[PDB]
Subunit: 315 residues, 4 copies
């Protein structure tokens, strides 16, 4: 279609501009020290470069196994790879955590189901291979930023629900999430039209590529559609009033309240400054507010982990 | 206009040559060690990449707060960004100072007022957010090189004057400048025609883009026009007889004398060598003369700071 | 020939894609620490950049001489150079070994004989110059990956056989191989047609360029053709069921058994994961399975070396 | 001229190939550790990027001043800059020496006189500014490689001769050379036609551009033409039988013998290997033969320096 190939070309130009911004940022930014990484593991029998993951660890491990963080990167479902959030992942690992971050195939080559299947395959891989190399899968923090927060919010629900597992064509994995931390999530993509910005303007096209025309995906594209009826882990919602997607965070809180989700928040006020933009704590680990946000996340995780251990007579 | 687009194309080719020279220099130059930086903070609600700043600090801080240096880079008003003077800024930070350096929009997309507004917004940002992350704003060194020295000289006057604040559309910031150090400033751009070089030849075009046709800017483009009637901080004028803009420094001294400005100088004689070119102490921090110049600046600042503390019964 | 230049263009496009993958991997991968290298030694009187080698050593040597590892890189006979396996070579050196890795001219500019002559010239160079700079040539591990495993398997036979030396136009070198370790070798290239993949599909073209039309090369292209009648060193076969060339490893084992070759294996099962792809232990030294594989190789070498020293009344 | 612009284009293509080889080498080569450099000093009042120099020093200085090495790079008079020999210069500095290396304008934009004037201006600069930053100019080693060895051999003669100073339009500098070390020099360019290689084939064109049509330059292009009648420092001739310019070294020895020049040699035999190519000790500081060669040079220098100090009642 004329207009369709044009719409794709517009979306790809927006992400090419982002790409240049990301490259310029990483060329200058301080890198977290005292971390080791293992790169480019295939998580299935495929040569698709996106179906790969990275693992990150502190350079000196206190213990043979460390609590796990699993990161799902953002980029509007159309952009990104396992290296995009490398500095944020190194930061978390430097705090004493075993961290995994995966690639997933991008729209428009797959739809939302292909993305969810890729993520569940990376989790399944980790359930087989993680413990032997340092991952404690009894204590798992699942986190995602922006479109990655959308995906993380869906994965958290799918993991609890046999029906959603069938619809998305995945099996449950043999570990649970201790905490699910969403950073400026786009968890209600059907509301994208009522805000301003590039994604919101192009919204119907994003929604179409996410669903791939499958009405079952249309009916399960939003957290508010997959949350119903499930007993979920606790959530932590991170962001702020200077997030260009703040309306999404406001919408998500209402979904949380209506569904009796257990959550805490770290939402920065506008008064804390204009620099606390969309996903600032992921893009600039080194800023003081980013350190405060990220440590607050890890401390929430640790508190939930400790409670679980007391509960399981394993303190 | 035919000739106007041609004149712009000539100026941009000169700065593209400079750009290549700067890239080649930074690829080789020693980098100051033992410094941390925090990059790419937006200082207002904008995605304009120029409306961002960097912060620099010693890697090991003696104290929770350190005296402040705020750097305004040069580049003829048409060139540069927050990274241009990164090695010079790291050097100063390595001496035990909290340093901020800002981007500002470039001609011909803005005029002088837009540049001044950007600088005051970065200062305002720092007044809100700096102290919480290490900046002592009771002791502030404002410095600029070349066109950045012009801008610094204007900002120093505007900060003291309600009338100039109104004309430039800025509010005063809630800290003062302890010392204003100008390195090979172009503080009297209306005199650009009486010297030789690329900028001088293209002078009327520079002056036009600086004023943006606004006669109030034409009447306040030169330090000699904004200095009148104000009680100013002390100045330090750095440069030398091998500065291609030495005539500007000579002109500025006469303005200083006529207006009873408090100043000291560090002007290198021709006998100290041909390498002590325009802004040499900013471009090559590592040279012995650069270290001597830069430490002499920091020691002048420290002496003025100590006197202020004695005066304020806070030694 | 129309079709011939087309077939070459297809092979070169496949290797250009590999090349990009290799560059992306090396840009991110951790580098082994505590190693020194000496680069770009010519091993004959030639300015052909491929007729050069690198040497690698631990940064702090326990001893004046260290046991030797000699690495022959892969790349389908059409691709690669002395830098391709640099991280794998550094890893081995970091374990206390003096390592040499050579370039060799590539198809279609030479044929298999030119490749074998280049390798023997690098070995001859090392026999003249290695000991003076740290190589213990009484204990030598010869290793190759993929096409490099093919080449290593042939070199091991040629070194033992006056007749093959004459056919390949090389002289024996004045040291022996303690162990020959093949990593996912393509040691039976004539069987390439009975598997799937790029190389297998283009097989007849690979075989033609390897032989250069020389029927004596056609009759000695496969390990099974050069193994006959010789007393060989011990071999170690490394790979696994997720190697895209696993059928080659299966074929080689049958050749080993039929010819009473002394060997051990380190073949990973499919259950050990999809990431244990072709030559994974060479491409990602840092992974735990790679470390286990590579140390197991070095320990086999060390055990064979110790036995030799006991046998030679030199323990 | 048609043929002249063609000949220049051929020479520039040869040097562009060399340039790529040099870039590939520096991307991989180990860099000497524990050195500081100061870059891009202009040595005259010019913005010509070639009329600049670098200074190199050990990172921790034993003493306030260190013996001096001054390096003149090669590149056929048509190629190179102050960064070309940076690793070799760092190596020498790491041994406890203050090292200067200069750019000089390249053929065909200047002729030999312009090159000699640039070199003498860098020496004059150092005589004014070197001691204040660590250079001991009582003990000076002058070294050059290939075309840089030609230039060094001429500079050594010119410095001793009022007549050659007048012809080349330079003044003597206020220090002497303790030793002049030539590495694979092309000191008799008029003999270039009787060897093989790119430079030799294009020889008449090189000779024309060197002389710039000036018959006084034609009569003083060769060391054998400037050596006559002068009392010279001692020389050290470095190279070997695998230098593609070995015939030049053989020719120079005959000139040395005929003119009663004081010299020593470090000429490697062919038996020491094919890797000991033209200027190998400059291109690969890290090789054992390079370290041996370079330390032997520095020890010869030190011995000559000590003798001078005993002679001057200053031990
Ligand atoms: Ca544990
Ligand atoms: Ca303080
Ligand atoms: Ca030994
Ligand atoms: Ca001394
Ligand atoms: Cl790492
Ligand atoms: Cl940093
Ligand atoms: Cl190294
Ligand atoms: Cl340095």
């Amino acid at each position: 279609m004329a207009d369709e190939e044009a719409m794709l070309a517009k979306v790809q130009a927006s992400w090419a501009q982002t790409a240049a911004r990301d490259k310029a940022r990483y060329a200058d930014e301080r890198v977290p020290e005292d971390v080791h990484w293992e790169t480019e593991y295939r998580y299935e029998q495929s040569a698709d470069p996106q179906q790969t993951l990275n693992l990150y660890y502190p350079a000196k491990r206190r213990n043979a196994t460390m609590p796990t963080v699993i990161d799902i990167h953002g980029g509007g479902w159309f952009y990104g790879d396992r290296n995009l959030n490398r500095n944020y992942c190194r930061y978390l690992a430097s705090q004493g955590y075993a961290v995994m971050g995966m690639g997933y195939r991008l729209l428009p080559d797959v739809d939302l189901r292909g993305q969810i299947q890729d993520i569940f395959a990376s989790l399944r891989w980790l359930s087989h291979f993680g413990p032997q190399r340092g991952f404690d899968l009894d204590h798992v923090l699942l986190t995602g930023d922006s479109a990655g927060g959308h995906l993380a919010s869906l994965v958290a629900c799918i993991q609890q629900s046999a029906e959603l597992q069938e619809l998305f064509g995945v099996s449950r994995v043999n570990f649970n999430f201790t905490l699910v931390a969403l950073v400026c999530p786009v968890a209600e993509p059907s509301k994208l039209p009522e805000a301003a910005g590039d994604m919101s303007d192009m919204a119907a096209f994003y929604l179409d590529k996410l669903s791939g025309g499958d009405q079952a995906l249309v009916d399960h594209l939003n957290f508010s559609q997959v949350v119903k009826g499930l007993d979920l882990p606790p959530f932590m919602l991170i962001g702020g009033q200077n997030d260009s997607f703040y309306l999404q965070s406001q919408a998500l809180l209402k979904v949380f309240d209506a569904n009796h989700v257990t959550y805490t928040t770290k939402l920065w006020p506008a008064s804390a400054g204009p620099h606390l933009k969309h996903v600032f704590n992921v893009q600039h680990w080194e800023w003081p507010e980013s350190i405060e946000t990220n440590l607050e996340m890890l401390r929430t995780f640790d508190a939930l982990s400790k409670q679980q251990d007391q509960a399981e007579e394993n303190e």
